Amino acid sequence: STGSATTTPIDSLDDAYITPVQIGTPAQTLNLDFDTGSSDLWVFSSETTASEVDGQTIYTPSKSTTAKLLSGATWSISYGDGSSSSGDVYTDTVSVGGLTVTGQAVESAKKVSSSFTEDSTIDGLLGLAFSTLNTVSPTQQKTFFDNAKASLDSPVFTADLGYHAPGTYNFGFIDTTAYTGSITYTAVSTKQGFWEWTSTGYAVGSGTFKSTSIDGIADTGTTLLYLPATVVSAYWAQVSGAKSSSSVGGYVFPCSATLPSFTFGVGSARIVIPGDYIDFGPISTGSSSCFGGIQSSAGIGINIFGDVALKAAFVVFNGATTPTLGFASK
Numbered sequence: 001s002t003g004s005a006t007t008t009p010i011d012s013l014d015d016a017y018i019t020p021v022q023i024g025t026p027a028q029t030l031n032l033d034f035d036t037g038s039s040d041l042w043v044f045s046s047e048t049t050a051s052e053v054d055g056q057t058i059y060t061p062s063k064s065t066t067a068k069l070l071s072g073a074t075w076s077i078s079y080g081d082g083s084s085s086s087g088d089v090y091t092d093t094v095s096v097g098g099l100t101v102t103g104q105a106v107e108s109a110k111k112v113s114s115s116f117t118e119d120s121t122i123d124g125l126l127g128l129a130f131s132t133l134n135t136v137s138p139t140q141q142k143t144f145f146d147n148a149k150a151s152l153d154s155p156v157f158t159a160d161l162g163y164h165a166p167g168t169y170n171f172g173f174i175d176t177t178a179y180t181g182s183i184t185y186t187a188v189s190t191k192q193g194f195w196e197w198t199s200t201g202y203a204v205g206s207g208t209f210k211s212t213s214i215d216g217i218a219d220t221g222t223t224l225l226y227l228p229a230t231v232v233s234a235y236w237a238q239v240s241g242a243k244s245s246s247s248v249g250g251y252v253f254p255c256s257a258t259l260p261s262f263t264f265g266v267g268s269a270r271i272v273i274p275g276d277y278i279d280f281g282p283i284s285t286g287s288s289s290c291f292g293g294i295q296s297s298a299g300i301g302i303n304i305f306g307d308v309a310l311k312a313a314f315v316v317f318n319g320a321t322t323p324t325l326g327f328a329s330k
């Protein structure tokens with residue numbers, strides 16, 4: 001079987017992407033943030049503290065005839081940005097773009113951090129990293145992808161994120177009309193539970209390509225591109241007036257500047273991020289200082305190929321017994 005669903009940016013800056021997901025019987029449709037950097041499927045629900053819900057669509061397990069409470073199970077997650085949520089666990093039927101999994105663990109939020117409350121457009125997360133990172137206790141639960149794997153035509157999913165535009169998540173098949181050229185595959189390490197891979201280098205604008213190994217994770221759940229301080233310094237040095245701002249928390253640049261492109265290596269192939277993708281707009285309304293889409297990973301501890309990088313490519317998440325990542329231009 002296969003599934004295919006349209007994913008849509010939540011605002012004019014592509015801060016995140018939401019994808020409709022059908023949960024329960026009869027279907028309750030929630031718009032979830034597909035996150036290859038985490039492994040929990042959790043949703044705003046009728047159990048969420050009422051003051052922490054502000055416009056989100058909630059899952060109501062009592063109205064689903066297929067929902068079953070998972071006795072004694074709880075969950076608690078903290079994300080790298082300081083966000084967190086926690087609650088109890090149901091199992092229920094979950095469908096993505098026609099692809100149905102029965103008995104999927106649906107984690108019901110009882111408490112969420114303020115960053116989720118203030119994001120009215122995101123009803124939850126759908127984790128797509130490896131199941132070893134799932135936070136359900138005492139019995140760890142499998143991701144949607146892991147549960148669907150056996151029934152998929154091919155054990156893959158693909159991410160085709162749009163620049164200021166809708167895109168597609170496909171499960172079980174590779175749409176050969178969605179990219180140009182060939183797909184270049186590269187090795188994945190699962191030792192930390194992430195889709196972790198090694199980029200072969202980078203170039204700034206039309207500059208010389210620098211061969212250098214950059215270990216990082218492919219994370220649809222993170223907005224920006226987080227790279228080592230040396231790389232990020234070389235990029236912003238080519239932008240007149242750009243500087244690292246402690247009060248803002250990263251590199252900013254005069255909004256009148258034109259940004260150079262950024263190239264990253266995948267084996268012998270090259271993925272080019274257009275400079276316009278790196279502009280995240282004024283730091284505050286009316287400001288002439290703009291926030292950069294490439295930032296240092298030094299404070300984070302890991303390099304992150306977030307949406308800024310992934311939306312420049314067609315990305316194959318190959319969940320075969322030896323997993324690989326595929327990148328193609330589009």
Ligand SMILES: NCc1ccc(C(F)(F)F)cc1
Pocket residue numbers: 035036037038079080081219220221222300302304
């Ligand atoms: N998108 C989920 C996520 C959040 C944080 C991290 C970090 F910062 F720990 F690497 C990775 C993945």
Ligand SMILES: NCc1ccc(C(F)(F)F)cc1
Pocket residue numbers: 016033035037038079080081083115116119122221222
């Ligand atoms: N990386 C996972 C993640 C995704 C979205 C959010 C936000 F923005 F909704 F709070 C936080 C963390």
